[PDB]
Design a protein around this ligand. Structure first.
Ligand SMILES: *[C@@H]1O[C@H](CO)[C@@H](O[C@@H]2O[C@H](CO)[C@@H](O[C@@H]3O[C@H](CO)[C@@H](O)[C@H](O[C@H]4O[C@H](CO)[C@@H](O)[C@H](O)[C@@H]4O)[C@@H]3O)[C@H](O)[C@H]2NC(C)=O)[C@H](O)[C@H]1NC(C)=O
Ligand SMILES: OC[C@H]1O[C@H](O[C@H]2O[C@H](CO)[C@@H](O)[C@H](O)[C@H]2O)[C@H](O)[C@@H](O)[C@@H]1O
Ligand SMILES: *C/C=C(C)/C=C/C=C(C)/C=C/C1=C(C)CCCC1(C)C
Ligand SMILES: CCCCCCCCO[C@@H]1O[C@H](CO)[C@@H](O)[C@H](O)[C@H]1O
Ligand SMILES: CCCCCCCCO[C@@H]1O[C@H](CO)[C@@H](O)[C@H](O)[C@H]1O
Ligand SMILES: *C(=O)CCCCCCCCCCCCCCC
Ligand SMILES: *[C@@H]1O[C@H](CO)[C@@H](O)[C@H](O)[C@H]1NC(C)=O
Lengths: 11, 326
């Protein structure tokens, strides 16, 4: 999840 | 009776004393004190002084920071443009008119201002939706071997402009209409006046269903999924402190985004619904301004939530605001 959460600006 | 009808307007004040004038012709100081008009203008002034810098900076910083120019950011840039439509179509015009005490630009001006303000608020609305979809798609991974790229980003943006015209354009050509609202200094969609020649009733249902309920459903499904995926991922990975943090931060954000969408549009929908259910009611000019206050202020708080609270945009903004770097 982490990379994706960074990509969508949520983490 | 408690209104006054005219060819294309509805002053929410009874003309039993004969004082009511066309909102295109003379000041409306009989449905609100002049000072309250100044406060209206004061509020449009706030929304500009805050709204323009926040949203312009978002575009500006994007022009000068490579790393921001990714497909998943397009929709956010889009949000910022939508906000500016509200700023220059709605807010400035309204600052100008409020100080005259009526909608000095006439019926056609009313159609322009109402169109651009609505387009703006609607592109923003559908952006917030598209963004939840894209986030759901990317993170929840509901499609085997799918990679979100530039083309999808563009479709998502185009989708919002089409949905927005689907709302702003009809009232320009027969299905509903634009007319001065609240204190008659700005023009919105007529959703409170039973006006058969334009079919307001069917339009209000369409708006409520397609432009409130759908969005509400799509946002809740998507972010609900996302919170689910992330809770699950963390539970299966409790040895990772970072993943535990992400789960908390992501949950907080979703609560903020959802509550924020409600605050912004619930009033318009809630009020619209009440008038539909209680056909013909005494609703004042100030009270009819409340739904607008909630929606228009999102030109400031949406970018706070979706831009200023985004780690990347923030750093770039700080760097740019602090001259060279920081
Ligand atoms: C709210 O209520 C008020 C009162 O009903 C209403 O205002 C009135 O509008 C009428 C016209 O619709 C005005 O009537 C005019 O009176 C003046 C006298 O100076 C005339 O200039 C006008 O012309 C008439 O007479 C001419 C003869 O030479 C004719 O050629 C012409 O066709 C007209 O017959 C006309 O008589 C009236 O003065 C106002 N009253 C007030 C108090 O302002 C108002 O329109 C209502 N509000 C809304 C939004 O509808
Ligand atoms: O490091 C970023 C590079 O790309 C920038 O522009 C890109 O922005 C979009 C990609 O999502 C597209 O519109 C465009 O085709 C891309 O090239 C920038 O223009 C480049 O100079 C940067 O090196
Ligand atoms: C300056 C004021 C603006 C931009 C107001 C815009 C308001 C809307 C696009 C309202 C939409 C809705 C209704 C008319 C009633 C049903 C629910 C909504 C929120 C979709
Ligand atoms: C943006 C315009 C709204 C200004 C905030 C003040 C509105 C609430 O304030 C009240 O509203 C009534 C209006 O009928 C007045 O009669 C009251 O004197 C006033 O105190
Ligand atoms: C931010 C730019 C300010 C725009 C200037 C607004 C000018 C308002 O114009 C006013 O309208 C009154 C009606 O109430 C008229 O009686 C007067 O002609 C005028 O003082
Ligand atoms: C680069 O490092 C120089 C920029 C530093 C500027 C710091 C000054 C802060 C100004 C804040 C503006 C508030 C005024 C609002 C007007 C009502
Ligand atoms: C308009 O005015 C009164 C308030 O004094 C309100 O109670 C009434 O229901 C309204 N009448 C109509 C016909 O809408």
């Amino acid at each position: 999840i982490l990379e994706n959460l960074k990509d969508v600006g949520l983490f | 009776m408690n209104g006054t009808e005219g060819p294309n307007f509805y002053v929410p004040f009874s003309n039993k004393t004969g004082v009511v004038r066309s909102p295109f012709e003379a000041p409306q100081y009989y449905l609100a004190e002049p000072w309250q008009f100044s406060m209206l203008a004061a509020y449009m002034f706030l929304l500009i002084m805050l709204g323009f810098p926040i949203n312009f900076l978002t575009l500006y910083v994007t022009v000068q920071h490579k790393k921001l120019r990714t497909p998943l950011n397009y929709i956010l840039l889009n949000l910022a443009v939508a906000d500016l439509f509200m700023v220059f179509g709605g807010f400035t015009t309204t600052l100008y008119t409020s100080l005259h005490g009526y909608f000095v630009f006439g019926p056609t001006g009313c159609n322009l201002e109402g169109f651009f303000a609505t387009l703006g608020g609607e592109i923003a609305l559908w952006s917030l939706v598209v963004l939840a979809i894209e986030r759901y798609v990317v993170v929840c991974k509901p499609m085997s071997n799918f990679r979100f790229g530039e083309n999808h980003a563009i479709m998502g943006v185009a989708f919002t402009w089409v949905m927005a015209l689907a709302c702003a354009a009809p009232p320009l050509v027969g299905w509903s209409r634009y007319i001065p609202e609240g204190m008659q200094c700005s023009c919105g969609i007529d959703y409170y006046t039973p006006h058969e020649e334009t079919n307001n009733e069917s339009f209000v249902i369409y708006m409520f269903v397609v432009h409130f309920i759908i969005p509400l459903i799509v946002i809740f499904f998507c972010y609900g999924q996302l919170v689910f995926t992330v809770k699950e991922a963390a539970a299966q990975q409790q040895e990772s402190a970072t993943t535990q943090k992400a789960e908390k931060e992501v949950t907080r954000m979703v609560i903020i985004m959802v509550i924020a969408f409600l605050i912004c549009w619930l009033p318009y929908a809630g009020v619209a619904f009440y008038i539909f259910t209680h056909q013909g009611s005494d609703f004042g000019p100030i009270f009819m301004t409340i739904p607008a206050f909630f929606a228009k202020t999102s030109a400031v708080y949406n970018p706070v939530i979706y831009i200023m609270m985004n780690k990347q945009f923030r750093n770039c903004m700080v760097t740019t605001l602090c001259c060279g770097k920081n």
